[PDB]
């Protein structure tokens, strides 16, 4: 709980509204936020109801120049951005600057796949939803509302998980070597009465 | 109620591994895998018995215990004795032509009420279709998954359906005649 320049949030298993509210409060506090893996955000309510909610959202359009009408964004990252910006005073310079401090992406791009990704417990579905309750996935609602990049993200995420697993195995082996040398070192038992 | 329980005793069916609601039951006839992630219940296995346990579950969630009990029992019955569905081809004037390809996994049907069309189905996994010579125009679907065999049966019956004709007189179609096990 210390002020970092950039917080990378792995949005897997989170709730859209709860994560948006927490992020919107951090941006007004003046913190750069990168919400990666937005195709895994969870929304309460069963999938058919959520798709009806979204398909009702498409209905809002101008009767003159739908080019000026409401802009319906189908990407899961843009869905999260719409949720976040609705919780911000974006009509003012403060809120407009706050939006510039948020980077919502699909998947985990290489500039952010090699950085620690914290999670928000106040938005996690496992901790915040009663078991036995129906929910949906934004990355699934997006595919059946118009989003057309689901397959590429899934493929590029399988590659990323494979590479990350290889990296962790190498780091775990090095950590095992360091861990083995730990008790071999003597001061770790000689004067460890301080609790370390 | 605090503790609602169901108990299942396993026959000579070898393995009933239940890792993470993904049951993989291996028996003499074959191996069936099926997922239970849709429900949240305890599966406590001891000896030759499995206990499906729900703590503090509501009646809606308690409706799923016996359902899980039944599907696991049906899976065990499939890996031990299997399932066999027997249909009789019913035709009044036009004989119905049946073809079996890729060892019974696709059925092509012709001449149903004088059709020039070819109605093709692909059977669900674990199902094989054969024609029995004991009785004429007899179709048999044999397999291990009751759901797959019976859903294959429903697909045959619904695709061979009479349209815009008076069903009180036009009796042509394919119907399920007997349901049972291989042994």
């Amino acid at each position: 709980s210390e002020f970092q320049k950039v917080v990378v949030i792995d949005a897997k298993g989170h709730l859209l509204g709860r994560l948006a509210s927490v992020v919107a409060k951090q941006l007004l506090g003046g913190q750069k936020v990168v919400v990666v893996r937005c195709e895994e955000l969870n929304i309460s309510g069963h999938f058919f109801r959520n798709k009806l909610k979204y398909l009702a959202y498409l209905r809002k359009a101008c009767r003159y120049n739908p080019s000026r009408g409401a802009f319906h964004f189908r990407a899961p990252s843009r869905i999260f951005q719409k949720a976040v910006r609705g919780m911000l005073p974006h009509k003012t310079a403060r809120g407009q600057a706050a939006l510039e401090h948020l980077q919502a992406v699909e998947g985990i791009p290489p500039p952010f796949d090699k950085q620690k990704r914290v999670v928000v417990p106040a938005a996690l579905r496992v901790l915040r939803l009663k078991p036995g309750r129906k929910y949906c996935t934004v990355g699934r609602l997006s595919s059946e509302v118009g989003w057309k990049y689901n397959d590429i993200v899934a493929k590029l995420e399988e590659r990323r998980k494979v590479k990350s697993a290889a990296f962790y195995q190498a780091k775990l082996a090095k950590q095992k070597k360091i861990a083995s040398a730990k008790e071999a070192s003597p001061v770790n038992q000689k004067l460890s009465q301080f609790g370390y | 109620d605090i503790y609602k329980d169901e108990t299942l005793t396993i026959p000579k069916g070898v393995t009933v591994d239940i890792k993470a609601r993904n049951v993989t039951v291996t028996g003499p006839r074959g191996t069936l895998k099926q997922n239970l992630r849709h429900v949240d219940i305890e599966m406590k296995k001891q000896g030759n018995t499995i206990k499906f346990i729900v703590w503090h579950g509501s009646r809606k969630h308690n409706a799923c215990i016996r359902s899980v009990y039944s599907i696991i029992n049906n899976m065990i019955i499939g890996v031990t004795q299997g399932f066999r569905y027997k249909m009789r081809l019913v035709y009044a004037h036009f004989p119905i032509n049946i073809n079996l390809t890729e060892n019974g996994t696709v059925v092509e049907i012709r001449n149903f009420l004088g059709e020039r069309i070819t109605r093709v189905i692909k059977c669900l996994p674990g199902v094989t279709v054969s024609i029995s010579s004991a009785v004429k125009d007899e179709i048999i679907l044999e397999g291990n998954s009751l759901e797959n065999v019976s859903q294959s049966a429903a697909n045959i019956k619904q695709i061979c359906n009479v349209r815009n004709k008076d069903i009180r007189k036009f009796l042509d179609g394919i119907y399920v005649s007997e349901r049972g096990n291989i042994e």
Binding site: V7, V118, L127 | -
Partner: protein, 168 residues
Amino acid sequence: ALKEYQVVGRKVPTEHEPVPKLFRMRLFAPNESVAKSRYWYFLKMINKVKKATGEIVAINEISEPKPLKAKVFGIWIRYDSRSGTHNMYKEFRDTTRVGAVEAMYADMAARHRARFRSIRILKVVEVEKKEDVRRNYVKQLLNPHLKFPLPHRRTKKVFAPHRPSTFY
């Protein structure tokens, strides 16, 4: 919170009634003032004794004799509903009569939208006999081999670095 009180009272003695009878009621109220008013309206509706010509002679808070023993309390109450009349009898397992009454008030406000003034308590009695218990959930608690995992585990320090355990 609530405290159980005993209120003993009588009308002011006169020539007609030199020795008025003494009326004692066991009732629950947050404080003595509410208890006295709670008693006075009860006395009005049961025995038609006016508040003006009466007086509260004794007020005594009562503490639970054995607050460290789990008990089962059956509560006979009367409800004012749309029809203005209903009778209910509930059972609560708790170590204190006050807590049982508090649980009853919370449950009734949760279920039948009942308020403190709408609920009047007839009798709160202890049921020591297991057979005399009527409620199945109370009997479930009274079974000897009761066991169950923790329900509703539910678990500033925002931005946790690791995923929650929410298990053992």
